Every structure is written in C-alpha cells, then in structure tokens.
Design a protein around this nucleic acid. Structure first.
Lengths: 520, 235, 342, 342
DNA sequence: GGAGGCCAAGATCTCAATTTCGTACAAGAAATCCTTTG
DNA sequence: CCCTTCGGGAGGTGCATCCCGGTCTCGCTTGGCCTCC
C-alpha cells in the first residue's frame, strides 16, 4: 500500500530530536534514513526493529501527496512478477486506472480468489454518513428535524457498535426507519431546489439499497462516524470486466471449489462476478493425492442441538456442556475455530483450565496478537470467524496444533432482506418466482458460502506435507458418513477428497441408530 | 488399457427400480451410458470402449461390475412399489383435430378403451424402492462418475421409457478387495455356470446388452439383494 | 447422430400434482414417494413423457395439416401409432428382436416414432423424472369443500321457483338422512375392521363377507336418495402437489438422434410452452411450469459434456439459445419427406 | 380456439382469509400453507375458482333473463350443474371414455360448462392459487372477544324488566359455574393430552377413548344449562388471513378458449368486480380484493405469446384494455346459440 | 342381409394407514478525506 | 470554571361454540340388439 511504505524526509527529523529514551535507536534510524524502501524490505528484514522505529509514526500519512510514491510506483512498474494486496487491485473499482497502467500488457493472478470475492462484499459498500448529510445542508437546514438526524445517529451507534458494517435485522430495520424519518425531514427543507436535491439523494440511496444487495449500519474506520451502508447492485460485474481487461487473468484459491466436480462447484464465481460462457475458459480442481494426514471425529445426529433457540442466538446448555467436555478431553495443543465471538465467549466461560493454556480472540482484536501470544505457549486457542486465511505457525514451520476443533459449522444467518431484494429484482426483471423460491435460492447460496468458509477453516490444518491433524466437528448437523441422505450432505465436501476414506471411517461422538439391524 | 482399481459406487435411489428378473448389472448401465456417449448402437464398438473403462474377465467373459445391491438404511428399507404405466387418451387425443374417426350417421365412432387392440394399457410392473443403490466394479472412477452423473442411465428395466430407478448423488469410494465377480464363492453378478460360483441358475447373455446374443446358462445372485448402507460404506 | 442431454430445472408456476394408483391410497392422494410417507416425492417421468409425446404429436399434426376436406389425414391406427405406439390394425414392421439398429427407414420417415418409440421399436427420447431440489417442497393442495350454492348466497334463491325451492329442501333433507345413515353404517364397518385385527381365519372370513355387505347397504341407501345420489355438501380431499415455485431437477435425453429428430423434439417443447401443463387437477391451474434446460452433447470420443445451447420455457416466451438448436429446428422444418401415414 | 393465460396480481383491500378443513386443526385456524407448517400461506385456487364460477353462473342467469317474478327459467339441476358441476338428476350426459370430441356439442351450447367443466368433461378454465409476495403478508386477524352487552353498557339495562334482569343473573351465574366445571374437566383433558405422547400406543387408544368420553362429559355439562347452552363471554379465536394491501401473484388459464367462452369468462370477472370478495369472515369485510390481470395468448408453435389486453378490477371500476377483450365480451354477449338446459 | 358400434354381463377378493432449513461474519487503501489549521 | 439528586411502585378477572359431509372409474372379451351401408 501507498501509506504502508516507509516515511519521507520527515524521517530525518526523527534522526535528530532523540527524545525517545532508548539510546540504541540512533544507529538503526541512521540506516533507515539512508534506506527509502518498503517497510517489509527494510524494517521487517533487518531484525524487525522491536521497541524502536515505531511503524505508527513512519507510516506515510493518510493525506500524503508527495510524488515520491509516484517514483516508487514507476520504479516497481518495470517488472514481470508483482506482489500486492487484493485491495490495490480493487482500488481500481472506481479509480479509473489512476494507480495502474496498461491492462492488455499484463496478466492478473489472483491468489486466494475466494478471499477476493468474499472481500468484494466489504467493498460492495456505499455508506450514507448522516453526519456528512447534516454538514452538507447547513443553509437549507430544517433545524427542527436535526434532532431526528441525531437520534438516528445515536441508534446506529447503538446497533453498529464498534463494527464498520452489520447486516443484522436490527440494522436493516434501522436503515428503513432512518430513511423514512429522513423522508419526513424531506418535507421541511424550505428551498424547493434544495428540497428536490435532498429528495433525489434519499431516493437514490433507497433504490441503491432495496434494488439489490444488503443494507446495514456502518461506523467509519476513522472518526467513528455513523453511516447507513448499502450495496451497489451493478458493480458485481464491473470487477469481472476489470479482470477481463487484463490480457489473461487467473483466479486461483484453496477453497474456490465448493464441490469436487469442477463444472458444478464453481458457479459461485460464475454468477457473483457475472461471468457467462464468454469467460469460463477452464474450470479445473487440482488437489494433492497425499498431503498430510487427517483423522476425523464428528458429532453424530444424536449429539445435542447447537442452538436451543437460534432466532435469539441461544446455545443449548447440553451442546455447550458436551463441547466443554470434549475440549477438556484433549491432550495436546489445539485450535478451536468457532463461528461467532459470542460462541467464543460462552465456551470460554463454561470451559476452565484443562491443563492446556487457553487463548481467546476478543471481538475486534487483530489475530496477530493472539497468535503471537499462543505461539510461544501453545495449547487451546479459540478463534472466531475473524481468522479466515491465517493459520498459527509453530514459529519454525512445525505444526503446533494436533487437533482442529470446529465447534459448529459456521452457518450463515437467514437474510430476510437479501431475499426480499433479490425477489424485487427478479419481479422487476419479469421473472415469475415466488418469495419462497427466492428464499430457497438464497439459502442454497448461503449454504455454499458456508461450505467454502468451513473449507477455509479446515485448511488451517495440514499446512505442511508432514502435518497431521485431528479435525473434530462437534456440530450435530454435519452429515454422518452412513447418513448419505442428510439435508446438508454437501458439507461432506468440507473434507478434502484425498481424505474421504478417513471421512468414511471416523469416530462418531454420538451416532444415531447405533445398532445392528436384522433386515440386512 | 487404463489402470483400473476396485471401486464401489453408491447412489441415492429416486424412483422405484424394476428388475428384469436378473439384477441390473452395472456393466449394462455403463454400456447404455457409452451408447449415449458414443452415438452408436453397434455392440462391438460400445463394448470395446467399455473395456477401456471397465476391467474385463477374459477367462470368465464378463466385466468386473457387480449386480445391483440395494443399500438400505435404518430409516428406509427395501420397499415394494409398482412401476405403473397407463395410456391416457385425453380429450385432445380423442378429438377430430388430431385424426379422422370413421363416421356413421354423422357420429364419430368412439374408441373402445375398455379392451381390444386400442385399450388403455394398464401395465403394472414390480419395483423395489430402496433408499440407495450400490454396485462394485474394477474400472476407471473418472469415466464412470462422468457417465453416471451425465449419461441418461438408470437402474432397472426401462429408465429410458418409464424413468424407473432414477438416481443422483453418485458417490464412488475405493475398495480393498475386488468384489465385482465373486464374494467368498458367491457370484455377485451374472457369471457362467462353469465358473464354479453358486447362486441362482438363469439364462442370459454374459456380456451386455442383455437383450442380444445367445442366452447361455449362467449363475446370477439374488435379484433383490439388500445390505446396510453402513456396511456398504465400510469398504 | 448425436446424444442431446437436456439437463435442467423445472420451476413450478402453479402446484404440480399427479394421480398414481399405487401412490394413491384410501388415506388420501399422495405423490409417488419411492418409499414410505417420510420420503421425497418425484413427479413421474411417465407423465412428462406422455405430455411431451402428445405435444410432439400435435406438432406433427400441425406440420402435416388437414386434408382438402378439413379432416386430419390420420386414421385410428396411425393416430394411435403416433400417440401411444399401439398397433391396433396389426400392420407394423416387425423388426428383428436381436438387431438393435432396425427401422432406420421408419426412423427417418417418422421422426415422432423415432423420438418416442412404438411397440417393438426402442424410443430415442428418455424422459426422466422431475426430482425436487429440497426437503420441504410438496404439500396437500386443493382440498376445500363443495358448498351448497343456496346455503352460501341467499340471493341465489330469488331465482328459484317455489317448486324448485321445495325440490332443494327435499334434496337437503335427503342429504341429511343419507349422511346420518351412512355415517352409522361406516361406524359399524369401522368396528368390524377393529375386530379384524384380533380375529382368526374362521371369524376373519365371517367378518369380511360382512364388510362388503355393509358397503352394499351403503350403496343401496345412496341409491334410495330420490333427488341426489351423492351428497353435494362434500369436503374435497386434498391432493399432494409440489409447492408453487418448486425447483425440480429434470433430466431428459435424446439418443444418437439425427438433427431432424432433435428438431422435432425442440418443436414439441416449444409447442408445449404454449400450455406448459404437467399432470392433472387442471381445474386449479395445476401443472403450469417454466423450465430451463441446458442442452449438452458428448464430445466425439471424449467423455466430456459440451454445451450446445439452452432451452428456457417461461410464460413470457421460449428462449432457444445456441446456434445448433436453431439448426436442428430448421432441419426438422425442412426434410418434408416425413411419412406419418405408414 | 386461443389459449388465454391471465397473469396478474391480487392486491388486498381488506384481509383475505379462507378456512380449509385440511389446513385448520385443533391448534387453531391457519391459512393453507403451501408445503409445510412453516411455509408461506396461499389463498386456494379452489376458493377463487368457486367464486368466479358462481359469478359466471349469475352472469348466465342474468343473460338468460329472469322471468317476470325475478325467477330464472333454470331448474335446480341446471343451477347445480352450472355452478358446482354436480348433477342431482343423474341425467347429465356422461361421456363414455373414448368419445371423439367428447362434449364438443355441450361445450358449444353451454359455454359455462365448457369453461368450468363437469364430471367427465374437462374444464377449460384453470384457476390457480394466489401466492403472496414478500416475507410477511399474513397474520392472525379477527380475534377479540364476545362480551356481555349489559356488562359493557349499563344503559342497556333500562330496557330490561325485573324478570329479565333476574334471568340475566341466572345466565351469568350458570355461565360462571359451568365454565369452572368445564375448565376443570378441560384441565384434566389437557393433562391426558400431554400424556398422549407416550410411546405405548396400545394405551394411546384407551387414552383417546378417555378423551372422547371427557368431551362427552363436557357436552353433557353444557347441556345442563337452562339459560345459555354456550358461554356468552368468550374470546374469539383469531383466523389467519393475508394482510391488507398484500400482493398475491395469481395465474389462470383457459386452454383452447373460443371467443364465446373467453367472453363469458371476462363477463364473469366483470360481475365479480361488483362484489370482489374472495373467502370467508365477510362479517369483517374480509375478501375484498383489487385484482389486475394481463391476458396473453400463445399461438402454439410460436416462441413468444402476444398480450391481448389487461383486466383491472378496482373499487373505482373495471378497466379492460385491448380490442381483443372487448371483441370477446361482445361476441359472448351477441351469440344466441347457448342452451344451458339439459 | 351382412357389417360396424353401444351396451350388459360375466367368479369372488385384495390390505398399508404417515408429525414443521441457517444465527452473526468483516483488512489495508486513492482516498475524497479534507480539511483542518486559517 | 463549577456540577447532573433521591425512589416509588409494576393488578386484580372473565371466558375460550355449535356442524356439515368425504363421489362416480377403470383399465376385458364376447354376443345381443340397433341401425347403417
């Protein structure tokens, strides 16, 4: 990233003014001033500069226009292999190639393409900052209405909390209520031209929201400002257009295939990016014949139901007790991968010290801190869904978790409004499909998303060819090998194909119908 | 000529399977699938291509393709349902817009549907409704997966006409012992009498299609065999 | 020749139901479940096959047209040959039993008898079942109850003459007495059936020759009704159907088919889209479907599916996508040398 | 003969409800749920079909003309046959299976029977279920509670004599004590019904007998009530109904619809617009609907259908667009070759 | 006078009863943030 | 450039219906009888 780079000649201001009471830094900062190169190239390669040369202070600036970034971009432009974050690619979403150059010249290899198309959703975000609208109309201001605008701004802060985006039913309900009360304020602007401008702005926000995608409440990364987030319903194919602009793009990932069949487990990208048969050049699934060893333990059908009442997010005491017991039965370092931070909280509260150091991922805490703390002292590590493509290395390349415990399959919540938005879209497109049909379609798409997410979760194990993992799925809904007619049979694709024999021969913690029938 | 490994195929039965006396052999299913894949009904070429995806016993003259075996779970078992075909002479079929009935007194002679050569044929056949179907075979897993998933082939008498024994979720798993031809001396598919395998005597061609070729004496397993799905997935 | 596999989904526009004798029992109308009650129903491929065969036969009738007298050229024998493949006159080419590729002349001359077979000639079109893609996609639709018109709308009585009003009152009285008699007879029948599950062979034989006589008594009492044999205020039994908007996976195929036979099949599908109705209970608009079928073929020699096009039937129209589908359709429109009269 | 498909939406003016014996149970009143208990309710196509059939029957009755004293020439049998397809005489000409053009003469001379069919004659008109749009468009409407008029308004008591006041006292005391007894026995019944779920079904039979005799004792206790047989003060069980303003996608079809039959159907819609009521609880004005339908014909063999016009029924009037619908209505109104007798 | 069609009559009997998806997630950047401050 | 109060308290009861009314069929062949040619 541009800001990620090492700071500018202000760094020389750091060479002198040695107020920082370290007294070992001066020489390394002298070296730094003579090395105007990327942080990773210099700071993370010459000892990591611990307890000195703070990255926070040398981080470019959020509003830095210096033209040295242009020089670095030109220096790195002459290249054949370039390594960068997906963000930089996605920056071109609206940036009209003002940071990149020729498309027909180069190729684009998106590694971790599942993370790319998952992060699109975070980038499928246009936020209506209510503070921004308040400040914009400071002359045509129906100040009597301002209270409402503040009151909604309070509610967003109550619902959004510390999250940049939340799609809970509270969030969409607050979206609708806020926009209705802002249409209320719409009949208060005195200037007719200003009244129409405001009305058109809120109308555009309304169609942007309802027409397609997800609505939510946002809290801006900087200044923590309340906002109402919506999803652009036609920029989903613009990314595909952007990829096709390159001479030949390759989307590759470790979980891109929901199923083992290429031509039926890939439609999530075919539809998400809008790719029709024009852009389906090859669809192939390549997995190693033998890479590591996988033992499987599963919760049978008779295992207790996870949620006693999932509508209010209530975990059944029986299932929590069983999970606590099974976790206490472990005898080596283990990585528990929950779905929610609430579930992390509940298992942490119910679970106690089991002779194995416990570690917890607090909501919002960057996984780097927890993983670093747990590395030196291994043991139980509960991590929520925040960790999607980060596995805990053993600090020398060795596996430091013999057991990978998926307490529950990370089922996505029902989207009663995404279904409504898709139904409205199809209805306006002329397609005649009942609401329940759209609900089924959305449910199947969410199930495929869940299959991919738990594929990523399982991929946290067996990071090396010598790695051996005991994967323990404690979810009652995970299909038993003998129950080939389970509703979530597709979840069998979570297990890699090579270890499917190990899926068939697995220790069931609570198998159902565990008897020997005579009508054989 | 391709490296063949013993595989067991288990599929979810969707409609009743009608067995034509002899249990449907997976070799026949694959033969039909290839006849669809190769646009040719000549037995020679379809067989030659079938040998490339299935192991063929030269000394015994059959493909390594076990007969149908019904995978029954503790939820659903082998059930007796009738595959039921009826002529439906609707008013549109019985109308002058579609043909010219012979007329007398200006009245159209109604079709005698109660009997005769123009009756409403109520053909009912037995059919076995198990929750799963299973076969064993020494062949290429890729080709058989592709065929069973994409070729219009079912298990039973007429999948083409009656749509009997529709299946889906075809899952292949490797086996440890070749259980296609023999099973502790019990033939799991049609085999010649001289092979020494016991079972049930019958007359049928050894090699598919099972409606052509001289019908020579064979030993075949029980037409309706049931096994627990858990035991079938053990391998 | 080519094998065209139509793999697709049928979205149900209005509930899809079918009456099957084995599936239907005295407990009620159930769809074919291929197992117990707690199983997944499937729409029979026989019903879809017959519907598409009727569509193709209508297409053939339209292509052939009518004689100068305005009457269809087909007679009963040819009509039944094309509709259901029953040779009523006993005049048909008895192809050899062991020769698979027999009737190439007949196949070329009669593309309908090629696509769907006749008796003794294997059909080329394999119409699979419509399998639901969910665990709850069927329901007890229809039902309701037949209500006496004059007991719901009093205004309708203003049209009846006093003689007819007395006739109505007599009908209602007869219905009431027939109900209160048949219900008691059925209660006795139920008691006898309850005693059927504790009986031995002798008393079983004694107490089942009694049940049928109670049924004959019911029939005689119903016949005694002078004004109406059957009660009008009848509760209609529901019929099991697929829910509205049920995504049913449908697998169809044509085997080693000339472009003309495939063209006839596509034309039959297009005509079927005019009235895309599958199954019965058409009174409740049951059977209306919209289907998208990806038409694939097999690569020469290679076991790989190529996508030749798509067939999307919807109420707004039929969308044929793929050049080769148009080629097949026009080829069927051409080759006027088809002979459906022999 | 055109295949007219009416595709449209029924907007709800007042809550839309229907009590189907299949869907409703002792748990309460539920709308017909499409697949499952937790599935979206649908207004049955049966109720809409019956409403439209009665509307068309009234259309035919008015067209044929009431006699001087407002009485239609039709007998009772003709009314029942036209409006419910049930023949009370038994003289209705059953078309033996295999008849070519079965009932073409009756269809020509009886457009109404051609549209809505009969026993043995297929009805050209298929009236589909009206499925709702969106996640929530239904709820438990109705409800509330019957209240003693005199305990709510004391002003009504000045209209009662001393004897009637004493009668009211007796009625209330009897209701209170009978309700106490009924609640006790119902508590015991509820305890037994909770014990019902035991796996010992052989004893479930005895428990069911116990429930039946408990209900008989409840009935006997209620019969032992001189003043009121039924408790006057009682909460009304709510009925599930589609919300006001609920949009329900609706589809109807008329296969091979002649201009006469199509015109009769449009006239039936027009007359139904006068009382646009679909279903029950009319006491709460339930059933009022504003429906707009697009009529589209589909010439078989044509890839796309053509929209003949649109029928819009609103409280402000009936708007019919397209010259085709007007032509069909006029053709039906001018054709004098219909005889609905038998 | 033969040759199509419509109707009636022909033996007693087969077994079986069904109950409602999924829950909570969010990283490094051109940004517009911005615009300051003044 | 102050400094944001205490707590009070949170229902009693009614009453929970009656009834209809659960269909025809037909899956074959033959001759007698009716009109047709």
């Amino acid at each position: 990233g541009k800001a990620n780079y090492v700071s500018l000649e202000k760094v020389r201001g750091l060479l002198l003014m040695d107020e920082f009471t370290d007294l070992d830094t001066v020489k390394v900062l002298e070296k730094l001033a003579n090395w105007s190169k990327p942080l990773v190239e210099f700071e993370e390669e010459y000892g990591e500069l611990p307890a000195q040369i703070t990255p926070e202070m040398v981080t470019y600036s959020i509003w830095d226009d210096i033209q040295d970034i242009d020089d670095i971009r030109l220096n790195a432009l002459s290249a054949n292999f370039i390594v960068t974050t997906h963000a930089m690619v996605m920056v071109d979403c609206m940036c009209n190639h003002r940071i990149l150059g020729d498309k027909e010249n180069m190729y684009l290899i998106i590694d971790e393409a599942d993370i790319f198309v998952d992060m699109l959703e975070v980038w499928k975000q246009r936020r209506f900052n209510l503070r921004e609208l308040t400040s914009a109309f400071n002359e045509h201001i129906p100040r009597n209405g301002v209270h409402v605008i503040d009151q909604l701004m309070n509610d967003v802060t109550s619902i959004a909390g510390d999250l940049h985006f939340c799609s809970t039913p509270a969030a969409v309900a607050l979206f609708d209520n806020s926009f209705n009360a802002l249409s209320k304020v719409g009949r208060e602007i005195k200037n007719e031209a200003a009244r129409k401008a405001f009305f058109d702005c809120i109308y555009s926000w309304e169609m942007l929201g309802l027409s397609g995608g997800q609505k939510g409440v946002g809290v801006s990364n900087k200044r923590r400002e309340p906002a109402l987030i919506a999803v652009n319903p036609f920029i989903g194919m613009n990314v595909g257009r952007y990829c096709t602009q390159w001479r030949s793009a390759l989307l590759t990932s470790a979980t891109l295939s929901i199923t083992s069949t290429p031509e039926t487990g890939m439609e999530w990208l075919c539809k998400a990016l809008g790719l029709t048969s024009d852009t389906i050049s090859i669809r192939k699934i390549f997995s190693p014949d033998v890479y590591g060893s996988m033992k499987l333990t599963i919760a049978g059908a008779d295992f207790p139901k996870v949620f006693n009442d999932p509508k209010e997010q209530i975990f059944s005491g029986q299932w929590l007790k069983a999970v606590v017991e099974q976790l206490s039965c472990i005898q080596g370092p283990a990585l528990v991968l929950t779905a929610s931070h609430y579930e992390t909280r509940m298992i942490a509260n119910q679970l106690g010290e089991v002779s194995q150091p416990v570690y917890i991922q607090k909501a919002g805490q960057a996984l780097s801190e927890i993983i670093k703390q747990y590395q030196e002292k291994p043991g139980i590590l509960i991590s929520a869904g925040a960790s999607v493509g980060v596995s805990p290395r053993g600090e020398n390349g060795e596996q430091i978790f013999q057991d990978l415990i998926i307490t529950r399959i990370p089922f996505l919540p029902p989207d009663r409004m995404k279904a409504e938005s898709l139904y409205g879209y199809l209805k306006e497109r002329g397609y005649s499909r009942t609401f329940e049909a759209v609900n089924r379609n959305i449910y199947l798409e969410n199930l495929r998303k869940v299959i991919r997410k738990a594929k990523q979760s399982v991929g946290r194990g067996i990071r090396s060819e010598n790695d051996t993992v005991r994967i323990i799925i404690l979810d009652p809904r995970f299909p038993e090998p003998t129950d080939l007619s389970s509703k979530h049979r597709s979840l069998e694709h979570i297990i890699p194909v090579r270890f499917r024999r190990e899926y068939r021969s697995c220790e069931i913690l609570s198998p159902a119908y565990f008897e020997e029938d005579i009508q054989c | 000529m391709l490296n063949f490994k013993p595989y067991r195929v288990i599929m979810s039965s969707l409609t009743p399977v009608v067995i034509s006396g002899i249990a449907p052999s997976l070799d026949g299913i694959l033969y039909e699938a290839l006849s669809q894949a190769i646009p040719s009904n000549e037995p020679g070429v379809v067989l030659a291509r079938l040998k490339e995806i299935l192991l063929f016993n030269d000394e015994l003259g059959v493909f390594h393709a076990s007969s149908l075996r019904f995978g029954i779970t503790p939820e659903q078992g082998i059930g007796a349902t009738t595959s039921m075909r009826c002529d439906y002479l609707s008013p549109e079929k019985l109308s002058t817009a579609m043909f010219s009935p012979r007329t007398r007194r200006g009245l159209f002679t109604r079709v005698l549907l109660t009997g005769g050569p123009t009756k409403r044929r109520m053909t009912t056949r037995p059919a076995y409704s198990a929750p799963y179907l299973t076969f064993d075979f020494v062949g290429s897993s890729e080709a058989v997966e592709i065929l069973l998933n994409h070729a219009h082939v079912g298990v039973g008498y007429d999948y083409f006409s009656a749509a009997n024994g529709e299946f889906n979720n075809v899952t292949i798993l490797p086996l440890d012992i070749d259980t296609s031809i023999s099973n502790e001396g019990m033939a799991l598919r049609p085999v010649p009498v001289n092979s020494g395998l016991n079972g049930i005597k019958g007359v049928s061609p050894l090699i598919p299609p099972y409606f052509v070729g001289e019908k020579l004496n064979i030993v075949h397993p029980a037409p309706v065999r049931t096994q627990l799905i858990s035991s079938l997935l053990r391998g | 020749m080519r094998t065209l596999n139509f793999n697709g989904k049928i979205s149900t526009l209005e509930p899809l139901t079918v009456t099957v004798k084995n599936a239907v029992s005295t407990s009620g109308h159930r769809l074919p479940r291929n197992g117990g009650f707690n199983a997944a129903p499937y729409f029979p491929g026989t019903s879809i096959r017959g519907t598409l065969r009727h569509a193709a036969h209508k297409v053939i009738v339209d292509r052939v047209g009518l004689n100068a007298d305005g009457k269809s050229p087909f007679d009963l024998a040819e009509h039944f040959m094309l509709a259901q493949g029953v040779d009523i006159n006993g005049e048909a080419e008895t192809f050899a039993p062991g020769e698979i590729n027999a009737g190439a002349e007949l196949r070329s001359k009669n593309p309908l008898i090629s696509l769907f077979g006749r008796w003794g000639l294997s059909g080329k079109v394999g119409i699979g079942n419509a399998i639901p893609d969910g665990d709850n996609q069927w329901g007890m639709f229809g039902g309701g109850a037949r209500s006496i018109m004059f007991q719901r709308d009093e205004s309708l009585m203003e049209f009846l003459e006093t003689d007819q009003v007395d006739r109505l009152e007599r009908l209602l009285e007869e219905q009431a007495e027939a109900s209160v008699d048949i219900s008691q007879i059925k209660t006795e029948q139920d008691a006898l059936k309850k005693a059927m599950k504790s009986a031995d062979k002798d008393t079983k034989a004694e107490l089942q020759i009694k049940v049928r006589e109670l049924d004959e008594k019911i029939q005689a009492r119903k016949d005694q009704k002078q004004e109406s044999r059957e009660s009008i205020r009848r509760p209609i039994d529901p019929y099991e159907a697929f829910i509205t908007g049920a995504e049913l996976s449908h697998r169809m195929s044509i085997k080693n088919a000339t472009d003309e036979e495939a063209g006839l099949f596509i034309s039959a599908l297009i005509r079927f889209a005019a009235e895309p109705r599958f199954g019965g209970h058409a009174n409740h608009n049951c059977g209306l479907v919209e289907a998208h079928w990806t038409v694939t073929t097999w690569k020469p020699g290679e076991l790989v599916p190529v996508t030749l096009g798509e067939i999307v039937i919807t109420p707004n129209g039929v969308e044929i996508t793929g050049d080769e589908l148009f080629a097949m359709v026009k080829a069927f429109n051409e080759n006027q040398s088809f002979d459906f009269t022999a």
